[PDB]
Design a protein around this ligand. Structure first.
Ligand SMILES: CC(=O)N[C@H]1[C@@H](OP(=O)(O)OP(=O)(O)OC[C@H]2O[C@@H](n3ccc(=O)[nH]c3=O)[C@H](O)[C@@H]2O)O[C@H](C)[C@@H](N)[C@@H]1O
Ligand SMILES: CC(=O)N[C@H]1[C@@H](OP(=O)(O)OP(=O)(O)OC[C@H]2O[C@@H](n3ccc(=O)[nH]c3=O)[C@H](O)[C@@H]2O)O[C@H](C)[C@@H](N)[C@@H]1O
Ligand SMILES: CC(=O)N[C@H]1[C@@H](OP(=O)(O)OP(=O)(O)OC[C@H]2O[C@@H](n3ccc(=O)[nH]c3=O)[C@H](O)[C@@H]2O)O[C@H](C)[C@@H](N)[C@@H]1O
Lengths: 194, 194, 194
């Protein structure tokens, strides 16, 4: 069962929103840890629930591994407004962030260390690979597979039944319309001055 | 008043989400019907509430007509999280799907057999033509008319006051900025590898 | 404390949605005022709460100033479904519209006369300049500054840490990927017939 206190590793902007979600869940105190300011992580800290509040997928993973290896429990932070199908699977105690108004539909699967950011949507039967980040307003249509460590930018989307290779980036505003077997950076067209 | 059981016609991915909405509404049992697997529709089935859980607009319509002609009631499945203005009009018992976190604002009109998919928005004074599908995250601005049988792809949008011809497709991620008097397939720019 | 009645200045489409929000907040009666139909504003009206229900930023501002100078209180209309971080700052009694399912995250700041339209998202640490309009589904990523009087079209978005100059327009569906020090109209690529 959840501890009264939680360690939040990452004390900048992402830490701010993780703290709001932790408070929404009923945590009474959030204690920030950070390598570059304020209080540091030490292997020797009391066993409170942990969360890794770092947006960068590669760094969140590295820090996640260090925390796990030190025997700490890395909880999921899931906003109460998130709507999760009873047949959806969200990996338990796996440092998953689920932000306000996220929807996860039937049989979708969420792997460890994932960020589902504000108002993102994961449609039925999706598979969202570990340490991926689905940003604000980003949406996966039915039966989409997102590879491990992927980043989907703000307001990006993936059409139904598509697969995105591990370690790929889908740019903010971009629409993925075909399978990508090989990793890459897939971008849309930026706003242009008239 | 709603029956305890509901027949859901279409036993694949769309059927999965329709079942979640039916359960959210308080249905106790969903019975899948499908022409190509499991239990079949027969004219002779007991009169439970029906829903047509088929995404394809043309097929949903054909099946809708068959079910109506056999004297069955095709209900609307409306998630409790949908926000519908008191002056909005949603055709009663007309096989309309309204998914989680859909918003329908003042005086908007929703015709029969429509799908309003996850987190779509129908702004004030819109008219959404029968058997249209507004996909996940797709949004119609104020006073938009969507013709009969249209498909609006994931994260597509229509600017205020525009009209889209019957039997048109607006691609995933695409932005309709002008009236379309003649049907067509209107597409945006797909993500491109850098 | 809120009056039982509210004057809504602007009796067209935007007035319709402002009225729904006012009713959601518990107002018992909305009285429409408009320069070009129905009942007019007069300096001499009883002091009910006011709201300026005009979408155009320039006109909303002009009318806002007239109403303020006549000693009326211009309230915020905030839908109950809006999720606002406890560390977010929304200017009090400042004619701000916050529509259904808007999310405002940690430390974001909302200035006077702003419209946050249906399902828009304002991420952590954003600054949204006075009399701006963030339309339906438009989203600002972390630490974005939107200048005074800006318009962000339906389903547009701004990438993290960017700044948009005062009096700018970001078109419907458009993705702002760089800082804009000088005002302009920044547009995406419209849907094209195949
Ligand atoms: C500024 C920016 O673009 N922030 C974005 C970023 O937020 P972060 O808080 O992850 O990014 P940051 O502002 O670079 O801060 C990272 C924090 O992690 C810390 N840190 C780092 C490495 C380490 O090995 N140990 C450690 O502790 C580092 O010291 C810093 O406080 O990702 C979010 C998902 C976005 N919403 C947000 O807009
Ligand atoms: C795979 C895919 O892209 N699915 C998409 C599709 O889901 P469906 O379940 O409609 O599509 P399907 O996976 O082709 O299944 C259609 C079902 O209808 C059945 N059927 C068909 C014809 C008939 O005349 N009688 C009959 O019964 C057919 O046998 C099948 O089980 O539309 C949704 C809106 C999307 N979210 C979803 O991603
Ligand atoms: C038709 C349209 O595109 N409407 C859009 C517009 O709605 P409005 O209601 O603001 O626009 P309108 O339909 O032009 O009506 C403006 C109202 O303001 C009134 N008025 C005007 C000037 C004045 O100095 N005094 C005064 O009172 C004017 O008479 C009229 O009734 O902005 C919203 C944010 C959008 N959702 C909506 O789609």
């Amino acid at each position: 069962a959840r501890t009264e206190k939680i360690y939040i590793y990452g004390a900048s902007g992402h830490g701010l929103v993780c703290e709001d979600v932790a408070k929404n869940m009923g945590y009474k105190e959030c204690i920030f840890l950070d390598d570059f300011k304020g209080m540091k992580f030490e292997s020797t800290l009391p066993k409170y629930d942990f969360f890794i509040a770092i947006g960068n997928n590669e760094i969140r993973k590295k820090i996640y591994q260090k925390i796990s290896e030190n025997g700490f429990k890395i909880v999921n932070l899931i906003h109460k407004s998130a709507l999760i199908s009873p047949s959806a699977i969200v990996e338990e105690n796996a440092g998953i962030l689920i932000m306000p108004y996220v929807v996860i539909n039937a049989k979708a699967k969420i792997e460890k260390g994932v960020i589902l950011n504000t108002s993102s949507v994961i449609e039925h039967e999706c598979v969202i690979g570990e340490f991926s980040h689905v940003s604000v307003g980003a949406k996966c249509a039915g039966n989409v597979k997102i590879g491990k460590n992927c980043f989907l930018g703000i307001n990006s989307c993936v059409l139904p039944n598509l697969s995105l290779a591990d370690d790929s980036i889908l740019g903010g505003g971009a629409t993925l319309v075909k399978n990508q077997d090989e990793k890459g950076v897939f971008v849309g067209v930026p706003a242009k001055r008239m």
